[PDB]
Amino acid sequence: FGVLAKIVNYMKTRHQRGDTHPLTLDEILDETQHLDIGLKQKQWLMTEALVNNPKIEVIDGKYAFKPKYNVRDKKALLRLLDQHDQRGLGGILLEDIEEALPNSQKAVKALGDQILFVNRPDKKKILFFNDKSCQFSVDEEFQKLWRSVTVDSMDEEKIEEYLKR
Amino acid sequence: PAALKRLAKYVIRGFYGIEHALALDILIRNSCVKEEDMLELLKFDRKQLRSVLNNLKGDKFIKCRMRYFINYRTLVNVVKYKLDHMRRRIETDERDSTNRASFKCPVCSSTFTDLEANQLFDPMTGTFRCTFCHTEVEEDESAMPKKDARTLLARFNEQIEPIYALLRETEDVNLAYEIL
Ligand SMILES: [Zn+2]
Numbered sequence: 001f002g003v004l005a006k007i008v009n010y011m012k013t014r015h016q017r018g019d020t021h022p023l024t025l026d027e028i029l030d031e032t033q034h035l036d037i038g039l040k041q042k043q044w045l046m047t048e049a050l051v052n053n054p055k056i057e058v059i060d061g062k063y064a065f066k067p068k069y070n071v072r073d074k075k076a077l078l079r080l081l082d083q084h085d086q087r088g089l090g091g092i093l094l095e096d097i098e099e100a101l102p103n104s105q106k107a108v109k110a111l112g113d114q115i116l117f118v119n120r121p122d123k124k125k126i127l128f129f130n131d132k133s134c135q136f137s138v139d140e141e142f143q144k145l146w147r148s149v150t151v152d153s154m155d156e157e158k159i160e161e162y163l164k165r
Numbered sequence: 166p167a168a169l170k171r172l173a174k175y176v177i178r179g180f181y182g183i184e185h186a187l188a189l190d191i192l193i194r195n196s197c198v199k200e201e202d203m204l205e206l207l208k209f210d211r212k213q214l215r216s217v218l219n220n221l222k223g224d225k226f227i228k229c230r231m232r233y234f235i236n237y238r239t240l241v242n243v244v245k246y247k248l249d250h251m252r253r254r255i256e257t258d259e260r261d262s263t264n265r266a267s268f269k270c271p272v273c274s275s276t277f278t279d280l281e282a283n284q285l286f287d288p289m290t291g292t293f294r295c296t297f298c299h300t301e302v303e304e305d306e307s308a309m310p311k312k313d314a315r316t317l318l319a320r321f322n323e324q325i326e327p328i329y330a331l332l333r334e335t336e337d338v339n340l341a342y343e344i345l
Contacts, residue, residue: 085194090187090208118183120209127208129187133171136179136332137325144258145180150250152223160246163253 003041004049006032011066016098022062025050074100076114081130093117093126103128166342172335173244185217192221195239197230203237248336255329259322263315267305270295274307 010032014020025045029035050056050063057065081087097103107115116129135141151159170193177189188207191198204211218237221227225243230236266279273295277285285302287294293302310318 085196087194088191088206090206092208116183118187120184120213133175133178136175137328139321139325141179148180148251148254150224150247152225156225156246160249163249 003032003034003037004045006034007049008066011064015065015067018100020057020065022057022060022064024062028063068099071099090120090127090129092121093128096128166339168335169241169244169339172332175332176244176247184213185220188214188217189221192227192237192239195241197236197238199234199236245336245340248332251329255322255325258318263309264305268293268302269305269307270298270300270302272300273298276305276307277302 007028010028023031025042026035029037029042053066055066055069056063057069059065077089080089093103111117114130116131118127118129119125120127137144173193177186177193181189188203188209191203191206200211200214204214207214209217218227222229225240228238228240230238264276264278267276268278268282268285269276275295277295282293285293285295294300295302306312
């Protein structure tokens with residue numbers, strides 16, 4: 001299993017590197033320095049780790065792309081967002097950076113266009129999201145706003161009654 | 166009530182912050198949902214999320230179903246009251262706060278009125294004189310925003326009135342939808 005994780009980690013780094021080109025098992029053994037893992041483990045790999053693998057990509061007669069399977073478009077979820085009922089997707093910042101290219105470069109331009117950052121995966125952690133209409137009144141705003149939290153203080157159907165009279 | 170969705174969005178954007186607003190965006194969709202599903206989608210922290218929902222509950226923006234198991238839904242129409250209370254808030258600001266006829270002693274920085282002139286005056290000096298600190302009183306432009314500051318807030322209020330006008334017009338059409 002540990003050995004298999006080193007295969008996963010290598011593959012992870014290669015995906016991160018930008019490439020998803022498939023390789024033979026032997027090459028992967030070599031590159032992971034696990035060539036002498038023995039016939040038995042190799043066989044376990046062939047008849048479980050490589051075939052019972054729920055998200056292994058077989059292409060060009062070789063095994064590729066293990067870390068990811070859920071997303072391949074590597075672009076903003078324009079389709080997901082367009083919907084008025086199924087809209088959404090708060091996503092991890094590290095997921096977006098891992099998927100293809102680092103967020104920060106696109107983001108600096110994006111920060112006043114399509115992206116919003118909230119501190120939420122811990123205050124150090126960041127989630128990416130987005131916006132739409134303006135603020136209502138120019139003002140100090142925070143001072144007026146803090147005097148406007150309504151009155152979530154009862155007799156309020158009666159405070160509108162009183163207010164109407 | 167598609168326009169009502171914008172007015173609600175507007176109002177949330179100016180008031181509450183983005184930590185409230187992202188959850189609020191889902192609440193804007195208005196659907197009965199479980200806390201766990203809302204937690205999975207948002208990936209917020211359960212504690213802060215409950216803080217948000219409870220603050221919203223305080224606003225009465227939300228209503229629930231008790232199955233215990235709890236489900237949350239939007240009460241929608243806490244909006245007419247919210248608009249009205251805000252107008253009173255805007256109006257109270259528009260009501261005068263500057264005490265006119267109005268002298269103050271520059272030494273004690275306290276305040277007195279026109280009526281208190283008839284008692285704080287002294288004939289021996291032919292001018293006014295404070296009580297506990299015998300000094301001449303002058304003007305009033307203290308703590309209460311200056312004459313030129315008054316103009317700046319009154320204009321600001323005057324600038325506030327139009328920007329909420331369309332919302333009232335939205336409200337006017339919504340109230341017509343409620344006549345029917
Ligand atoms: Zn005095």
